[PDB]
Amino acid sequence: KNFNMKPRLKSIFRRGLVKVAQTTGAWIITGGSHTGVMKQVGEAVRDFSLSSSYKEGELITIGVATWGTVHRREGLIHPTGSFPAEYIL
Amino acid sequence: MGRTGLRGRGSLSCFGPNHTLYPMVTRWRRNEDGAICRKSIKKMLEVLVVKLPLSEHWALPGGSREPGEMLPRKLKRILRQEHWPSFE
């Protein structure tokens, strides 16, 4: 579930979590979807990779979620095998 | 319910309780194929409210004892302008 904390904690946690994966070249295994703690980590990458949008230190956040809790299972299937396709949030 | 410091007015047109009703018409609402409220965890609701063009809010029929008639007929204080005399 979603949550809102003090913006000092936001300005510390969302800043430093970038500053981990910038220097080390890490992976960030997260929980997938758009709600909750997994939303707040997606804020931190957006707070970096479009403001200080640097190819140097491309952060890798791997989302592991449930094909079945996804909101649009349809529109994403292709027995063809490969697709540079789209969907709408 | 305690003194409100007022008069005895006939804004109610009645020196009393004026036992009224409100038909809370309730659509447990939808999306393309059936939805809930994802905002907290709960269920999202849809309600018909009528915006009267003069007073600046969006209301429901006040079943406030239509004069000469009963309480389900000032239910039709506005519901007579919803055109059906069939279903009662």
Side-chain angles (χ1 to χ4, degrees), chain B residues 9-22 61-75 77:
Chain B
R9 213 158 176 259
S11 313
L12 273 77
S13 155
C14 176
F15 272 62
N18 194 14
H19 214 269
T20 178
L21 57 94
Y22 277 118
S64 320
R65 205 250 172 271
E66 190 84 31
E69 304 199 320
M70 47 172 64
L71 316 183
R73 309 201 212 174
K74 212 176 154 183
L75 168 140
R77 182 60 190 172

Coordinates of all heavy atoms in Angstrom, one line a residue, chain B residues 9-22 61-75 77:
Chain B
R9 N -38.7 29.6 13.5 CA -39.0 30.0 12.1 C -39.8 28.9 11.4 O -39.8 27.7 11.8 CB -37.8 30.2 11.3 CG -37.9 31.3 10.3 CD -36.5 31.9 10.0 NE -36.5 32.9 8.9 CZ -36.1 32.6 7.7 NH1 -35.7 31.4 7.3 NH2 -36.1 33.6 6.7
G10 N -40.5 29.3 10.3 CA -41.2 28.3 9.4 C -40.3 28.2 8.2 O -40.9 28.1 7.1
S11 N -39.0 28.1 8.3 CA -38.2 27.6 7.3 C -38.4 26.2 7.0 O -38.4 25.7 5.9 CB -36.7 27.9 7.6 OG -36.5 29.2 8.1
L12 N -38.7 25.4 8.1 CA -39.2 24.1 7.9 C -40.7 24.0 7.5 O -41.1 23.0 7.0 CB -39.2 23.3 9.3 CG -37.9 22.6 9.6 CD1 -36.8 23.5 10.1 CD2 -38.2 21.5 10.6
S13 N -41.4 25.2 7.6 CA -42.8 25.3 7.4 C -43.6 24.4 8.4 O -44.7 24.0 8.1 CB -43.3 25.0 6.0 OG -44.6 24.5 5.9
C14 N -43.0 24.0 9.5 CA -43.5 23.1 10.4 C -42.8 23.2 11.8 O -41.6 23.2 11.8 CB -43.3 21.6 9.9 SG -43.8 20.3 11.0
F15 N -43.6 23.4 12.8 CA -43.0 23.5 14.2 C -42.7 22.1 14.8 O -43.3 21.6 15.7 CB -44.0 24.2 15.1 CG -43.9 25.7 15.1 CD1 -44.1 26.4 14.0 CD2 -43.6 26.3 16.3 CE1 -44.0 27.8 14.0 CE2 -43.5 27.7 16.3 CZ -43.7 28.4 15.2
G16 N -41.8 21.4 14.1 CA -41.5 20.0 14.5 C -40.4 19.3 13.8 O -39.4 19.9 13.3
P17 N -40.4 18.0 13.8 CA -39.3 17.2 13.3 C -39.1 17.2 11.8 O -37.9 17.2 11.4 CB -39.6 15.8 13.8 CG -40.8 16.0 14.7 CD -41.5 17.1 14.2
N18 N -40.2 17.2 11.1 CA -40.2 17.1 9.6 C -39.4 15.9 9.1 O -38.3 16.0 8.5 CB -39.7 18.4 8.9 CG -40.0 18.4 7.5 OD1 -40.8 17.6 7.0 ND2 -39.4 19.3 6.8
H19 N -39.9 14.7 9.5 CA -39.2 13.4 9.3 C -39.0 13.2 7.8 O -39.9 12.7 7.1 CB -39.9 12.3 9.9 CG -39.0 11.2 10.5 ND1 -38.6 10.1 9.8 CD2 -38.4 11.1 11.7 CE1 -37.8 9.4 10.5 NE2 -37.7 9.9 11.7
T20 N -37.8 13.4 7.3 CA -37.5 13.3 5.8 C -36.7 12.1 5.5 O -36.1 11.5 6.4 CB -36.9 14.6 5.3 OG1 -36.6 14.5 3.9 CG2 -35.6 14.9 6.0
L21 N -36.5 11.8 4.2 CA -35.8 10.7 3.8 C -34.9 11.1 2.6 O -35.1 12.2 2.0 CB -36.7 9.6 3.3 CG -37.8 9.9 2.3 CD1 -37.3 9.5 0.8 CD2 -39.1 9.2 2.6
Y22 N -33.9 10.3 2.3 CA -33.0 10.6 1.3 C -32.7 9.3 0.5 O -32.0 8.4 1.0 CB -31.7 11.2 1.8 CG -31.8 12.7 2.0 CD1 -31.7 13.3 3.2 CD2 -32.1 13.5 0.9 CE1 -31.9 14.6 3.4 CE2 -32.3 14.9 1.1 CZ -32.2 15.4 2.3 OH -32.4 16.8 2.5
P61 N -33.2 13.9 -3.3 CA -34.6 14.3 -3.0 C -34.9 14.3 -1.5 O -34.8 13.2 -0.9 CB -35.4 13.2 -3.8 CG -34.6 12.8 -4.9 CD -33.2 12.8 -4.4
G62 N -35.3 15.4 -1.0 CA -35.7 15.5 0.4 C -37.2 15.1 0.6 O -38.1 15.9 0.4
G63 N -37.4 13.9 1.1 CA -38.7 13.4 1.4 C -39.4 13.9 2.6 O -39.8 13.2 3.5
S64 N -39.6 15.2 2.6 CA -39.9 16.0 3.8 C -41.4 16.3 4.0 O -41.8 17.5 4.2 CB -39.1 17.3 3.8 OG -37.8 17.0 3.3
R65 N -42.2 15.3 3.7 CA -43.7 15.3 4.0 C -44.4 16.4 3.1 O -44.7 17.5 3.6 CB -44.0 15.6 5.5 CG -45.3 15.0 5.9 CD -46.3 16.2 6.2 NE -47.7 15.7 6.4 CZ -48.6 15.5 5.5 NH1 -48.2 15.8 4.2 NH2 -49.8 15.1 5.8
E66 N -44.4 16.1 1.8 CA -45.2 16.8 0.8 C -46.6 17.1 1.3 O -47.3 16.2 1.8 CB -45.3 15.8 -0.5 CG -45.9 16.5 -1.7 CD -44.9 17.3 -2.5 OE1 -43.7 16.9 -2.5 OE2 -45.3 18.3 -3.2
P67 N -47.0 18.4 1.2 CA -48.2 18.8 1.9 C -49.5 18.2 1.4 O -49.8 18.4 0.2 CB -48.2 20.4 1.7 CG -46.8 20.7 1.3 CD -46.3 19.5 0.5
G68 N -50.2 17.5 2.3 CA -51.3 16.7 1.9 C -50.9 15.3 1.5 O -51.8 14.4 1.5
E69 N -49.6 15.0 1.3 CA -49.2 13.7 0.9 C -48.2 13.1 1.9 O -48.0 13.7 3.0 CB -48.5 13.9 -0.5 CG -49.4 14.5 -1.6 CD -49.0 14.2 -3.0 OE1 -47.8 14.3 -3.3 OE2 -49.9 13.9 -3.8
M70 N -47.7 12.0 1.6 CA -46.8 11.3 2.6 C -45.3 11.6 2.3 O -45.0 12.4 1.5 CB -47.1 9.8 2.6 CG -47.2 9.2 1.2 SD -47.3 7.4 1.3 CE -48.9 7.2 2.1
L71 N -44.5 10.8 3.0 CA -43.0 10.9 2.8 C -42.5 10.3 1.5 O -41.5 10.9 1.0 CB -42.3 10.3 4.0 CG -42.8 10.6 5.4 CD1 -41.9 9.9 6.4 CD2 -42.9 12.0 5.7
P72 N -43.0 9.2 0.9 CA -42.6 8.8 -0.4 C -43.1 9.7 -1.6 O -42.9 9.3 -2.7 CB -43.1 7.4 -0.6 CG -43.2 6.9 0.8 CD -43.7 8.0 1.6
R73 N -43.8 10.8 -1.3 CA -44.2 11.7 -2.3 C -43.5 13.1 -2.3 O -43.5 13.7 -3.3 CB -45.7 12.0 -2.1 CG -46.5 10.6 -2.1 CD -48.0 10.8 -2.4 NE -48.8 9.8 -1.7 CZ -50.1 9.8 -1.7 NH1 -50.8 10.7 -2.5 NH2 -50.7 8.9 -1.0
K74 N -42.9 13.5 -1.2 CA -41.8 14.5 -1.3 C -40.5 13.8 -1.6 O -39.5 14.5 -1.8 CB -41.7 15.3 0.0 CG -41.2 16.8 -0.4 CD -41.2 17.7 0.8 CE -40.1 18.8 0.5 NZ -40.0 19.7 1.7
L75 N -40.4 12.5 -1.5 CA -39.5 11.7 -2.4 C -39.6 12.2 -3.8 O -38.6 12.5 -4.5 CB -39.7 10.2 -2.2 CG -39.0 9.3 -3.2 CD1 -38.5 8.1 -2.4 CD2 -40.0 8.8 -4.3
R77 N -40.3 15.1 -4.7 CA -40.2 16.5 -4.8 C -39.5 16.9 -6.1 O -39.8 17.9 -6.8 CB -39.5 17.1 -3.6 CG -39.4 18.6 -3.6 CD -40.7 19.3 -3.7 NE -40.6 20.7 -3.9 CZ -41.6 21.5 -4.1 NH1 -42.9 21.0 -4.2 NH2 -41.4 22.8 -4.3

